[PDB]
C-alpha cells in the first residue's frame, strides 16, 4: 500500500535507471533521524501574556497550551 | 425562392456543421439554443443567435411555435432541421411550409409516406427493391404471427410498425413465446409507441448494416453518392462507421446503386437522404428504410466523394438542379468514430460530466467535428455525442493505420467516453477483416467483443496510495527526458518529509450513500437516482405497490431508465408528473 | 537495411509531421530538442526525446556528433531530412550512412551535385530544359559583371549563386549602382558562407513561381506526384500556396510532366522532392531550381494527389520499389497558408514571446499543422511560422469560400501574426480573378495590394555521474523537494 | 520500488546517502 515513484514516458536502460535513482537518492536530504522532538515549555509565550483574572483564555489558551500533548 | 438567411433548428456538432456550410455558401446564419446550451460553440459561431428558453427539448427545440417565432423575429427565410428533434416531424415540415419559410428538406407528403413502416414496405415492394421474407401486411394476433412461423420458420423478428429507436425490434425462437411477446409488444405499441401496428420478418444472425447515400433534385434526377458499412452498433444505434462499404461484390455494389434511385423515384423523394439496407449472410440486400434527415455519417462520404453533402440540401431547397451529373469516384477509404459521453467499461452506459480538457487530434487524414470544447458541460438533457473523428487514406489498411495513430493522439478528460473502445476495435482482427468479409456484425459488440475497458474512474483517489500527494517533474538522464512522478512524502535515506506527525493514510470512501452494497436507504422516500426528465409516472396516490414495481420512468440523455419501488407499501405522497425535470436525490414519492 | 526507428533532427511542423508519418508507419520516433523547446509538441508526441542543449541550432542541430550520438544512444535505424538545419548536408548524410544509419534520402553525391545553381545550369543544359536570359557561369570580377551587363541588358537582378535562400538578391531599374552592388554581393557571400560565387540575370518581375513534385525509386522509377503555385510572396518570401498550379495550359502541363521524369532520371534522384520552375507573364517556362529535400508545403501535395509523400519517402528509403507509375490526377483544389509570427502591418517584422490563444478551426475540408499549441513561446532565433492552415474542396472557388470562413474562425492571441493578411488576400478581387486569369504576381503583395491591415497596438542543476560503463550528465529542475 | 509504464521494478540502495 505504499506510494511508489513512477516514470511516465519512455523507458530508461538499467544504467539510466540506476543513475536516475542514485541522483534522486542523493537528493534525499534531511535530519537522518526524524522523530518527535523533546518538549520544553520553559518561557513559552503563553506564560508571558497578561490575563484578566476572569479571562476565558486562561482555559482555552493558557491551560490548553500547557496540557496539550 | 433561393436561400439567403438560414436558421438551424438544432444543437451541437450538426449545428456547427450546418452553420459552417451556410457561411461557406455565403448565407447569413442564425442559431437557436435552449437554456442548457447558451454557451456551446455553435451559439457563438452563428452570425446571430436566439434563445428558445426551456430546460427540455419539449420545452425548447420541439416547440413548433417557438421555432417559427425564431424565424419570424430573425427574418431568416430558410430553416434547416439537422437531425433528430423536428427533422423527422412531418407536422413541423408542414407547419413551416404553411408558414412560408423555405424548408430545407423533402416534401411533407414524402416524409409522411416514408415515416410509416408498412407504407414503406408497400412502396419498396412496388419499386421491387431487394427485401427480406416476411409478412407483407400487419398481422392480427399471436396465432397469426404463428402463421408466418408455419411457412418461413425461424428465427422470427417482430416489429411494431411505429416502433423504433432500437426499442421495438424483437426476435423469437418458439411458438410458446408468442402470446407473451404480443401482449407485451402491443402494450408498448399502444402506450409508448402510440400505435398497435406490428409485423414480422426473417431474422439475420450476423448481418452487416450497409447503406447508400442518395441525392435527388426537385426534378427527379437521382444519384447514389456512395455507401457505408456501419455494423458496429452498440445496440441498434451506431458507433463506428466507414466508407465505402468494404468487402462486397461488384454485383452487390451495383445492385445497391441501382435500387436506391428507384426507391427515391417511387417515393418521389427529393433533397438529400440515405437508404438503409441489411446485407445478409446469403448476400441478400434487403431494404429497411430511407431516412429523411441528412445522416450524421455524411462526412465520411464527403471525404470519399469530394462533394459537400449538406450544401446540396440548400441548392435543392432553392430548386436548382444538380450541378454534378454523375456518381463521383469513391477515392481512397475513410473511417468515422462517434465520440460520446458513454462508459464502455460500465457496459456502454451514458454519463454526464464536464469536459475539463478537449485536445482533438489533428494532422494528416484527420478531421474533427465537435459540439464541445475545453470548458463545456454536458447535462442529462441531450444525447451523448460529443464529436466525430473522421480518418482517411489510400486504402482501408492505410486509413486504419491513420486511425490507430489518431485515436492514440486523442485525449478527452472530465467524462467517460467510447475512445477506449474505438482504440480497441481499430486494433481488433475482427474489424481489420481478412480482406474478403467482416466477422463484425450488428450484434458483435454486445456478445463477442472481449471488453478490456476498465470503468471510468475520473480523477478520483480510489486506493490507499492514491490519497498521497504527488509532484510530477522532468528529469533528464544521460540526455534522455523522463517525466517522473514523485510522492510528496516518500522516504528515501534521511530525507525530510519522509513522515508527518499525526497524519494517517487510508483508502478513501467513495462518494456513495452508505456502503457499496447499501444501494438504498431504509427510509420510505423513493429518490431519483439520476439527473433527467420524469417522462412517465405509473401510480396514483394511495395505490398499492410492491418492491420492484415501476413508479416512474426518467429520461437521462434520451436513455429511458425505469425507477422502481424499493419496498412494498403505498405511495403516500407524489411530488411530480410527467414532463418535469428532476435532479438527483429528488423525492419522487414516499412509500409507506 | 530496414527502418524500425527513425530520428527526426528538426523542430517545428516538420518534426511533428515526420513523427506522425513514423507512428502511422509503425516506426518508433526519436525527437531531439533544445533548451527553448524541451516541452514543445514534438517533444510530447515523439516516442522518445533527447536533449541537445544550447539555445540555438548553431549550438545544437548543426553539431553533427550530437545527432549521431543521439542516434546511437537511441539505437535509431534512420534519420529524416526535414527543412532547414542539416536536412541538406551531404557530409552529414554520408557520416550517417558510414555509421550504418539509413539516411532517408538521395545519395550524398547526388545531393552535392544538385545543390549548386551553377551545376544546376550545367544539369539543365544536359536535360535540354528551357533556360532564361542570364549568365551561364558565375562572374569573376566587377569588370566581368560590367562586360556581361551591357550585353544582356536592363532590367537587372544580381543574385548570390550559392546559399541564396531568398535574400541574396538585388534589383536594378538603373545600372549606376551596380559596381557597389557586385562588390557587396561578393563580400557578403564570402563573409556569411565562404563561397563568393554569384550570378546575374534579367529581373523577371511578375512571373508565377511553380513546381512539380515527384516520387522517385532507388531503382530509378519516377512519377510526378503534383504541381503547385507559390507566387503569393512578400519580398521573395511565401504566404500562401495553391494546388494544383491553376489554369496552366495543357502544353505547359505536358512539358512539365515529361521534364520532371527527365530531370529526375538524369540526376539519378530518389526519394520524393520538388522540381521548381518559373512561368513568365507571357506564360513561357524557364527552369529555376530543384530542391533536394521534400518541400515544406508537401502536405497539400500529399492530400491533393492522394499520395502519402512523407510515407512514400519512408518507402523509398526502406528500398521498396515504387508502386506508382501514372502521375496521380489532382482532384478538386486546395490551399496551404503559412502563418508567421510577423506583423503584416509593420513589414512582417517578427514579434516573439507567448501565443496565449490558439483555437485553430476544424471542419469540412480544413486542417491545421502547427509547431505551436496554446501556451507556446517564440524566440527570435527561429523561423516565425507558427502553423499552416490547409483547406480543400471540389473546386477552387469552393475552397476559397471555405478559406474565407476558416480564416475568420482561426483565432490566435499573444503575438502579432499574419492571420489578417490571409483574411484580406483570400477576400481580395486581385486574387479571385475572372475564374480564368487573375492579377496577382510575385511583387503584388508589396506593389499592388492596397493593404488595409491595421497595425498592432531557472536553468537546470546539472550533476555529472559515473555509473558502470557509462558517464551520464543528469539535469535536475531548478529544485526538487523529494 | 519504482513503477515504469506499468512494470513493477525493484531497486536496491545503500542505507547511507544523505
Automatic annotation (TrEMBL), chain A:
Superkingdom of this protein's organism: Bacteria
Gene Ontology molecular function, alphabetical: acetyl-CoA carboxylase activity; propionyl-CoA carboxylase activity
Protein name per the record: Acetyl-/propionyl-coenzyme A carboxylase AccE5
Organism in which the protein naturally occurs: Mycolicibacterium smegmatis (strain ATCC 700084 / mc(2)155)
From-to range in the entire protein, with total length: 26 to 94 of 94
TrEMBL record, chain B:
Necessary cofactors: biotin
Domain called Biotin carboxylation: residue spans: 2-446
Keywords: ATP-binding, Biotin, Fatty acid biosynthesis, Fatty acid metabolism, Ligase, Lipid biosynthesis, Lipid metabolism, Magnesium, Manganese, Metal-binding, Nucleotide-binding
GO function terms (MF aspect): ATP binding; biotin carboxylase activity; metal ion binding
Biased composition (Basic residues): 504-514
Occurrences of domain ATP-grasp (ranges): 121-318
Pathway assigned to this chain's UniProt record: Lipid metabolism; mycolic acid biosynthesis; Lipid metabolism; fatty acid biosynthesis
SMART domains given in the database record: Biotin_carb_C (SM00878)
Alphabetical list of Pfam families matching this protein: Biotin_carb_C (PF02785), Biotin_carb_N (PF00289), Biotin_lipoyl (PF00364), CPSase_L_D2 (PF02786)
Matching InterPro entries: ATP-grasp, ATP_grasp_subdomain_1, BC-like_N, Biotin_BS, Biotin_carboxylase_complex, Biotin_carboxylation_dom, Biotin_COase_C, Biotin_lipoyl
Protein name according to UniProt: Biotin-dependent acyl-coenzyme A carboxylase alpha3 subunit
Ranges for domain Lipoyl-binding: 515-592
Region (Disordered): 497-524
Biological process (GO), any one: fatty acid biosynthetic process
Reaction(s) the record says it catalyses: N(6)-biotinyl-L-lysyl-[protein] + hydrogencarbonate + ATP = N(6)-carboxybiotinyl-L-lysyl-[protein] + ADP + phosphate + H(+)
PANTHER family listed in its UniProt record: CARBOXYLASE:PYRUVATE/ACETYL-COA/PROPIONYL-COA CARBOXYLASE, METHYLCROTONOYL-COA CARBOXYLASE SUBUNIT ALPHA, MITOCHONDRIAL-RELATED
Organism in which the protein naturally occurs: Mycolicibacterium smegmatis (strain ATCC 700084 / mc(2)155)
Entry EC number(s): 6.3.4.14
